[model samples]
Every structure is written in C-alpha cells, then in structure tokens.
Target: VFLSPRNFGGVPGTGVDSVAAIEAALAAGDVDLGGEHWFISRPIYCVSGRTIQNGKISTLAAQGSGFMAGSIFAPGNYHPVYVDPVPKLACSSTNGSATITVSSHEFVVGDLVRLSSTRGIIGSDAVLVPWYMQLARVVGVSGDTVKLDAPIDTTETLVVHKATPAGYNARFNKPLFVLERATFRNIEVDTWDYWTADSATFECAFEGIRGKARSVVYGNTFCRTNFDNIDITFSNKASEMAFGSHDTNLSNIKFRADSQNWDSTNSVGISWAESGRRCTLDNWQLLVPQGVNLSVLVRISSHRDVQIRKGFIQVHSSSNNILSVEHYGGDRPPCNNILFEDIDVNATGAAAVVVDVYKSANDSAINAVRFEGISYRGATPSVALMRQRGTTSNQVTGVRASLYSANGGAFLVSSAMAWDVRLYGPGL
Candidate 1:
C-alpha cells in the first residue's frame, strides 16, 4: 500500500526537516513523496523492498548538529546505517582470508571492506597485484583479529595459501552505500547548500564522497535493481551513482547544474568494479559542457561483462578522454569480455581522444574489449577513437575497434597498445 510521509511528521514543501517522516513512511511501505521538496540535514538509511520515488530529498550534508551529522548508510540493506571509518593498519594474508590484527576493529559480520588503498602502499613503489588489491567481507573476528571471506591467492591456481606477506598500511575500508534491490524513480537531489569542501570521505563512502549509493557483491552487486529518471544537482562531488554494481540497470540519470561550473575532475559517469559484472547502462546522457574537466567517462578499471548500447556522449572535445578501459598503473585487474554495441560521440571542437586504452606490466590483461558500430561525428576525430597508450605494442591481441578521420592519418597513430586493439570495421 502507498504511504504518505506527511502522515508521520514529514515536513515536505515547507523546506523543513522531513527525515523522520520519510523514514517512517519507508518503514511502513513503499513511499511516493509526489515530487515535493523534503529537506534533510543527514542521509537516509532506507529499508528494503521500498520504492522511493517522485520526490526531491534535499540534504546540506553537514548542516545538522552533532559529531556524526552527515554520514550515510553502508552498502548492504540496513536501517539507520552509520559512518564509522576505519583507520589504516597492517594486515596479513592467510588461508581462506586475510587477517587484520587490530586492537578493536569496528567491523561487523558481513561488513564490506576495502583491503588496501593504492596510496596505502608504504614505500614509494609498493603496489598490490590485483590478487592482493581486493575488497572482501568480514566473515569472522576474534580478539584483535578480523578475518575476510576470500582467500589471498596471488597465484592463478586459486589455492588458499596458509601464510603470505604482511600488507603494509592495510585496514578495513568503509562499506559502500548501496542501491540494492531498491527502485529509485523520478527523484531530485539538490545539494546547492552542501556544507563541506573535504570530499576525502573515501574511508566513509565510495570515491571519498559522503553521499554515494553503491551495489557490492554481498550488497546486491548481482541483484536486480532499477534506477529510472533521476536528476542530481550537486554543489560538490558527492552526487555520483553507486559505482560498484552487477546485474543492475541504470537509465535516464541526469547530473546537471545551474551553472556548467558543476564540471570538475571527479565527474565520473560510470565506474564498475568490486567484482561488478553483468551490468548494463542504456539510454543515458551526461551533460558535458564547454571546458568540462571530463573525468574518466565510463571508467572501466576492473570489471567484466558490461555493455553501453544506444547512447550519445556530447563531447567537449578538448584534451579529456571520453571512455577508458585500462589498468591503474599498478596490479589493477583488467576487464574481461567487454562490449560497446552502438554508441555515438558528438563533438564541436577538434577532439583530442575519444576512447583511450592502456595496459601495464604489473598485472593481468584484458581478454576482449570490443567496440562495434559506433560513431564519432561533428569534429575532426582524434588520432584514433580507440587509441592505446604508449607508441609500442604491449598486448598480443583482444582489442577490436573501428575508427574515422577525414585525414587518413587521423585515426592511425602507431600506438604500442593499439597493436593489441586492431582497428577493423568502423569507429566507436
């Protein structure tokens, strides 16, 4: 049955506090705020099986009073989720899991944890191979010791080793906030008065933004969730979607602003990782204006079985790249069998790079990343739509692309990684 949050002291339309009313309505059943403004000073810890739709839930992020005023929930389904970020510590890999020896960890059973950070490497050149760099769950915790769900198997044999190296600067990361099994439709979030410049909440939320909706493996990373038609106007970088997703469908999401100044270096359109697989983004649009910072659009760090079909990226066409499916200079895992069926990129100025690919010597390699039946129109296409990094060949094969350039040499730069990505039929 439909529930009205107004029945539970939800102060909508008056721009007053409505966190309690909305929380009550969601606790009862599915809620439809019917396109009204409900002001909140903190994040909402939504319950399960509720469709949150047709409303503008506004938050100033830190305007509320208290020590924990602006934190959101963790990635899994939980009511009243809190924000308690863990500190960086030392860990060790063992059979069936890694061990974090701490005085007293804040981790609970089923809590998602980032095993280590890229910068957490102690020495200047310390890098965790994709096998070592991982996100796992808290399965067991003894006195001053927290165990994980997966084994720290660096070798491809997948054997759970008894003992391995001690991880430097290792600790439990904050659980990603989820969009698990939840249906979000026709919603607006205006963070114009958001109260913080310190977006380094990476220990609290995904990508260091206190406001992030996520989908991890245990947190519906493979659940069937739907997000339809949402508008987010951010005064800061806390308005991105739940990046780690699987078996999820996200369509019709608009991240716009009163001024194009909303464009910044952190403006990521889609980031799929944390073992996120079998997801799709269809019929989506990102408002890329002039001089856009153009962060990694459709960033594919370590994922598999994803598709971006039937959409257009309005390219600012400067030096920023449109899409990237590459490694992160460390032992980051490579994508597996990715496809871009039919997409278009429209540009006005002379675009620099449309699609950029990179391969590193530190970790695994991507098997197949295919770009088929795509278009790059309105300006002189870059050196190549799917240009690989470096001028020397790294990967043997597996990147199949097509390109277009009025100038014959425009899309045919002799990239080393391009040797693996063969430009065959057309441009993507």
Candidate 2:
C-alpha cells in the first residue's frame, strides 16, 4: 500500500500525472512503488496477481514519440519505456556512410536502425549463405554520434564488440509493457525490442509485442540488442506469448551483441519461434564478436519438451547456426524430445549443429533429439560439425563426437545425407 507520487497525490519529480497514482495502486492490490525514480507520463497497467513491490518504475521522457517505426499491438504492449540505447560500431564500415560512437545521442531525426554482422567475404561461395541485413533512417545526430539513411554493404571493416567490459549504453523511448505473471528482478536493461503503440506506428520489428507466460526474468543483464535480446515470437501466430506461454523461465542471464550486428535467421540469443513448450533456459552467457555476423546462441524454430541447461555460446561470426533446428511446417509442432545438457559451443562458424528438415511426406520433421554433456571448441568447420537436412528417422540420439576439438574436415558426418542418420560416442 506504500506507493509514491507523494504517496499517490502526484509529486515525485513532478510534472504531475503519475498515471492516476500508478493506476490507482495497480487497481487496489499489492504495491510499493517507492524506490524513487519514476516519472511516468502514461502506461501503468497490471491488475492481475499484482505484486510490483520494489521494481522501481520509470518512464517520463514526456511519453516519448521518437517515431522510429512501429507495429505489434495485441493486448496493449510496452514495458520499461525509454527507447534508443543499443548503438555501437565505433569503427567498421564498407560502402556508403559509416561512423558510430553513440552513448546517448538520443536519436530523433526519423529514428530507425538495423545493421548487422558487417559482412565481409573475399573469395566467397563455399556453399555461401551470407544473407545480410540493414534498415536505416535517422539522417543525423552529432556529439556522441548517429547517422544513417543507407550505405553499409560490407566486404570489409568488421570488428567491434562491446556488450560488456563496461559501457553497454541504454535506450528505450517506449515499447515494453505487455507483461504477464510478471517479475523483473534486479533490473538492468540497455535495450530490448517491441513497438507500435498508436500515435501513428512507432516502429521496431522482428516480430514485436512481447512478455507473456509465467515470466520470471532473473538477476538480469541485457546490454545490447539490434534484433533479439529476449523477444517472444509474434506474427506467425502464437499469442499470449505462445508455447508454454504458460511456463517460461530465464535464469542468471547475460547476453552481449555489443553491436556485433546479429545478421538474421532472426538474430538470436533466445528465439523459440513457434512457441516454447515446457520451456526452461538456465545460466546463459552468450557473447558475439570476431568478424561479427552473429546468428545463434539458441534458435530452435519450433519446440516441445524443451530444456537447455548450463549454457555458454561464443561465436566468432560467419554463422549459419550455432544451434538451429528447423521444420517450419507440417502443421507445426515436432521439434521433438529436445534436450541439450551441459551446453557449450565455441564456433568458428558454418555449423555447430544445424538440422533443417522440412520436406515431410507424412511425419517426423525432427524427433528424439538429444545431446548430453556436450562441449565443442573452435575452428575447423568450413562445413559440418553436425549438419543435417530433411526428415531423418530418429533425427538425432545421444551425440558425442569425442566431445569436440577440431582443426579440419569431418568431426562427425559431413554429409552421408539423411533418413536414418546416426552418430554415437567417441569420434565416430
């Protein structure tokens, strides 16, 4: 019952209007809004099992309408509003116009950003899949730095990583307030994506409108994000936060893209697209740098009975899957029996484990997937550390290519193709 705004009359760093005394103490229930740092101009909805004790609410940049570009309006979406704070690229450019060094240049000349992985290839085609990304608009902003209308093709100029080592920078002028069974602990978010709250299309996309399910984000730390820091899949349809959007859990998290430009497959650290069923992601530390074209820390296009314990993935870019499992249709729902125990991948890129099975005549898009006590470390994958394509009976079972320490060629199945692909203990 202890909320602020001068205990609900309006006055904590006043411009008045504390959203009707914080939505009338979140509709008469549990609250303690007194950590002092709130400047809300609007948006304060939570009346369902409310327990926002000391989450230290904030938002009063005069209800930012920075207008970058927006869409994703299901049940009223927007959380932790503050906008524009995931900017990097201090030095690394190829074509048009490049120069980045922003701390708080509070972009607003038309606002819109998307440039990932700074693609650089010389004698390409070893089975190339370098599908790049770039979406600009901000024209100009000096002081810290900010300028981009277009021009960043990438054939060189690649190297800039900073998610941590201190200096992550924060930005979010609005978009993040669609929560359920909420609990944002300790609080530390530099950038997280989700947009469009009518005032005319405040853009930010990669499937927006987030925060669903039995959410409980732990002692958090998300510093950089151009695409995905933790965005629940939307727009392929799976609302209320899709799959086990009834049982979500992220623990001791730490993600760092530090402007490495996570060039798509829908740039990720955690993307269970079709929906997370029996979800659980624990102890994560995903860092992307070195040639920077980041793709996967974890992206299993669709899921079921999922469990990824003890994670640590470090990619030195040129990736097409650090851990990608796909089979997008067949009625959708068959990334079966998933489990990756003691996960640890340090990839040099190409494939650390990419199963793209989508050609079903009947069933078995992917089945009995399991990797126990896994560990793979660096270089020697111009192709195949484990790459499968299309329906293979018993998709994968107990994989162990002598743990993993490669420097050349096949470590396990470069391509015997599939339809009964199997690999067992001790460097098969």
Candidate 3:
C-alpha cells in the first residue's frame, strides 16, 4: 500500500503528519496515494502502523519494504519511496537505548535513520544529524547492536515513547524519503549509490545551451538536447537564461569533441565557434564509432582562441559521415583572431574535411591555421578538404600525410609530413 503528502504544499508539521492529508488527496485524485504499488514524490514516515492504502494494508508486505525518490532533473516528476523503518540496532543497558522494534518495518543493521523517542528515554545530547529523512542501507544484524554505516555514537540517543500529544502525528512506519536537492552532495549521493531499488523509469527534462552557454555543456552529456547555434549573448532575447558569468580569459582553453555522434537529423558533438577566442586544444578529433547516425560530425563556427593537439577525428554515417570545419553566418556576427593547430580528420563513409572559407558572402580569414597530423584509416578515398572555392591568406603550410591504402604509395607531395604547420599566437 502507499501513504504520502499528496500535494506539493509544504506544511509546518512533520511530513509523516501529512499522511492523513495524502489519503485525502488520493481520494480526491489530487495525487496518486496507495495500492499494491505505492508511489510518492517525497519521503513518508509512519510513526504508528504499517503503511496501508486503498483500504488494504499488508503485514507480510512490511517484511521487506522499500522506498525511492527522484532528483530535480530526473526523468520523471516523482521518484519512488521504500523504507526499512525499524533497523535492528543495539544499545548498552547501562546507557540504555531500546531495541528499535522491527515491526512490519524491514530495517536491518548498518541502516541510517533519525533517532527520536516519545518515550523520553533519550537524554540531552548535541546531535548533528542528516534530516533529509533519508534512509541508510543495512549491512549486518548483531545480537544487541545493529551494524550501521552511519556515524552513530553511544552518547547520542535514539528513543521511542508512547505519547499521543496534540499534532504529534508521526509516521509509525516511515518510508525513506530522498530530498530533491540532497542528491547533489557527496554524502547523500554516496548513500544513493548503495541504496538502490528495482529498476524503474521516470522522465527528466533538459535544454541545451546556445551561444556562450554552449561552451558550458560543450563536451558534457548535459548538452545533448536540441541544438540552436543562435546565441543570445550580451542582450539577446533568445533563451531566457544564460551560462558562464565571466567572458574574458579565453586563453589556453581546449576545443575537442571527445566523442562524436550524429544521426538522421541533428549532428551531435561539441563545436568551437570560429568567433571563439583564446582557447587551446592540444588534442581533438571527429570520431563516429559503432551505431551512430551517419551524418554531420562537427560544424565549426567563428571564434578566436581555439587550439588542437594530437587526436583522432573519424566520421561515421550510413547517410553521410562528413567532417568539416566551416564558417556559418547566422544571427551572430563574423569571425576573428583564431587558430586550429594539429587537426586530424578520418572518415569511414565519404568526405573527411569540408572547409568553406570562400564565397565572399561569408568570412574566412586565417590569422593563423595549421593542417597537421591528418590520418585516413578508412576504405573510400578520404576526401580531404572536399570543397574549397577560394584563396585562404590563412597560409596552409603543414603536414597533410596520406595513408598507404589511399594512394598505393607515399610522399608524392613532400612526404605529407612536410605540411606540419604551426601558427603564431600569444607566445608563439
């Protein structure tokens, strides 16, 4: 069965006290309350009887009860809940703490939970405890003492008393509750790591950052959502929110995809805008391995201060695995002082590199650009620089080595390694 505070409203009393309110909400369809399957957004504490719902409660069900809760951004709105309320623990008869009655609550040793007593046996003690009402996993049950992973000492008191005081409605059988914000911390996160439940599913909502915000989630998984290069940096009314408070200090920053993947629709991977400035990448690649949609890998934009070191850039696509470092003129402005050092482009399907600096309609000037460490480990001829229809004062003086599989031999144009080009920047 199930019990919980149905509504999102935060009452002044204990969450357990709201059980009656939750039952009402369920009856009213305001929230999903109880049944053979009990689901709740927050934690539930039962100070008296085992949780019952739909006019049906089970004593046997309490044998091995469990609870679950979701995080702020977890897929679903509400995470589940389970509880082993009465964990077996021991107390010295001298500094006497009673055996927490393992009633219908299936608490084991090594579990962590708050200690409160209506019996008034617990004496005064300075206690700093985690109050998320979060649960602790049980490890071993000893004769008198229940082994717990939490830090509980003899001086501290955990008590239970029989006093039905006014507004004193405590969850007789408390279900472990997980706070939304608590998952972001070390202790709580580690706790969740050990405290797992049956596989469940929930919906999580997220949005990708545009413009400057893109850099924040560039290589991170958090930016895998929708892609819109149009940024609202410095008074642009696009996304209501922005990322990164500091705009200066763009030096020594790396521009890399780490892993590249694309599909029938959107291209997935981090991209450094050509307008990007003061960033350095010692290693970078355009790789698309295994089951990814064969399409565009990375679409470079205008930005300064971007560097590249030794790395691989393999393109994979059934439709098209084309890797390109081009310039796109959109709602944003043009490009400026930038550098792309040591770039390697490999392909499996078709084209390798698509650099479009031509078409006076766009801006493609190279204050400094290098085409070093280019490797082709695919079958079809690696189309390097697929379409370039203009002059690049951007000096292309570097190694453009070719694999033996492509041209049967090597060194047709100065051992390709002769193309090891370097650009002059801040400390060139």
Predicted model with the maximum TM-score? 1
Best by lDDT: 1
Task: Rank by lDDT, highest first.
Answer: 1, 2, 3
Query: Can you write out model 2's per-residue Cα lDDT over 30-50, one digit (the tens) per residue?
Result: 556565544454435444344
Q: Write the per-residue lDDT of candidate 1 for residues 290-316, one digit (tens) a residue.
A: 655554556676666777776666756
Candidate 3 at residue 264, lDDT?
A: 28
lDDT scores in order: 0.48, 0.41, 0.28
Instruction: Order the candidates by TM-score, highest first.
Output: 1, 3, 2
> Which lDDT tens digits does candidate 3 get at residues 295-324?
454434444434444655655543343333
